Ligand binder design. Structure first.
Ligand code: HEM
Length: 395
């Protein structure tokens, strides 16, 4: 077997991870790593676990060596369902679709900031700022305070993505304290004088005589911040990278905008920014050939599932036309990403504008192998230098 530690962020920063996944799928689909940690590597195993939440629970927390927090993603039904219905008020199909104009304007502003230069870092300048600006605007964050939230988000993702030192633990707690303070200020303000922002909508949400408490509002908005920021970033950067590495794909999209929805799905399949979520076993079970024990956690390897040849023909081919494309980047089942529509909307609006406004975009070096973030949870490109013919801003 490959000698790997699936809780080590260095594994996921390796471009040989998919080679390891390939071995797992072919030889021990429910794999145990060098330390005995169990992981579902095939699409079939991931789906089968997702469909059995009573056996494969979220209530032990979704990271391998960390306890549950009081938030939707660390809950099982029926409690989870109530929490999700409450928060869903902020993510109805209509409410998300109505953000189109505002998100488009953010995209044009971001491209305006670099279009005259002829070069930018696609990650720093386009992929990273968009998701935080979208969430920031929902949360009432002033534009000049976005970078503060970007840092807190990175701190928290880092905490979820490793076993932190004492120092980094304190940094995480301090970031949470700051987020908590900010959010409680917003909650107090909105409970008194409602606007149309996210905290306002969540405060007014009601399900079967139940409402979100201040504690729950802090936790659920935090989950939204962390869940929707760096994930979206990595699909935007890594997905655009594949368009640039395969010019035929870039060319297809540019000459046919109707192919955009399929392109976004392939970007999602390929990038799988969430590399795993954990499930805790509620009983001993024989699962796709591997004996699992009550109380242990098993990873769902979403990237591995997304490259499973049982489901995706020639999975190492990036193909924007792929149909079907039933990837698991957003998971499956009762915890299926609540923000999936918003993420898709951001990715579509920015990609449409990149294709249009930076039509000859290319990677600084076509032979570059760019670094991935060492993290065991959410990961993608650190940097992506790109060049293009300059143009005047739209303003
Ligand atoms: C490309 C971007 C994103 C990816 C790849 C992603 C991925 C995921 C995954 C894998 C899960 C857990 C699914 C499972 O275990 O089966 C999840 C859950 C969740 N996501 Fe996302 N996500 C993205 C963007 C967002 C955004 C923009 C939001 C904004 C709110 C968001 C909010 C949430 C929430 C609240 C949950 C918990 C759902 C539940 O437990 O019922 N995510 N996401």
């Amino acid at each position: 077997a490959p000698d790997v530690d699936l809780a080590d962020g260095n594994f996921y920063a390796s471009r040989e991870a998919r080679a390891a996944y390939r071995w797992m799928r072919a030889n021990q689909p429910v794999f145990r790593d060098r330390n005995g940690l169990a992981a579902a590597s095939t699409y079939q195993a991931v789906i089968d676990a997702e469909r059995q939440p009573e056996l494969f629970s979220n209530a032990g927390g979704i990271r391998p060596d960390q306890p549950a927090l009081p938030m939707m993603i660390d809950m099982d039904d029926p409690a989870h369902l109530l929490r999700r219905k409450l928060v869903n008020a902020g993510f109805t199909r209509k409410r998300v679709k109505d953000k189109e104009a505002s998100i488009a304007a953010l995209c044009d502003t971001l491209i305006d900031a670099v279009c005259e230069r002829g070069e930018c870092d696609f990650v720093r300048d386009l992929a990273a700022p968009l998701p935080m600006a979208v969430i920031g605007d929902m949360l009432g964050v002033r534009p000049e305070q976005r970078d503060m939230f970007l840092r807190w988000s990175d701190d928290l993702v880092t905490f979820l993505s490793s076993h932190v030192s004492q120092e980094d633990f304190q940094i995480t707690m301090d970031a949470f304290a700051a987020y908590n303070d900010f959010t409680r200020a917003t909650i107090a303000a909105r409970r008194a004088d409602p606007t149309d922002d996210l905290v306002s909508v969540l405060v007014s949400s009601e399900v079967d005589g139940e409402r979100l408490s201040d504690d729950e509002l802090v936790m659920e908005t935090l989950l939204i911040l962390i869940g929707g920021d760096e994930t979206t970033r990595h699909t935007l950067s890594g997905g655009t990278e594949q368009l640039l590495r395969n010019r035929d794909q870039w060319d297809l999209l540019q000459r046919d905008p109707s192919l955009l929805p399929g392109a976004i799905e392939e970007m999602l399949r390929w990038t799988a920014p969430v590399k795993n979520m954990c499930r805790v076993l509620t009983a001993d079970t024989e699962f796709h050939g591997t004996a699992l024990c009550a109380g242990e956690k098993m990873m769902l390897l979403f990237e591995s599932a997304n490259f499973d040849e049982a489901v995706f023909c020639e999975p190492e081919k990036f193909d924007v036309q792929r149909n079907p494309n039933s990837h698991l980047a957003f998971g499956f089942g009762t915890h299926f990403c609540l923000g999936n529509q918003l993420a898709r909307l951001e990715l579509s609006l920015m990609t449409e504008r990149v294709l249009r406004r930076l039509p000859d975009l290319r990677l600084v070096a076509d032979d570059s192998v760019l670094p991935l973030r060492p993290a065991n949870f959410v990961s993608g490109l650190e940097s992506m230098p790109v060049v293009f013919t300059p143009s005047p801003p739209l303003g």
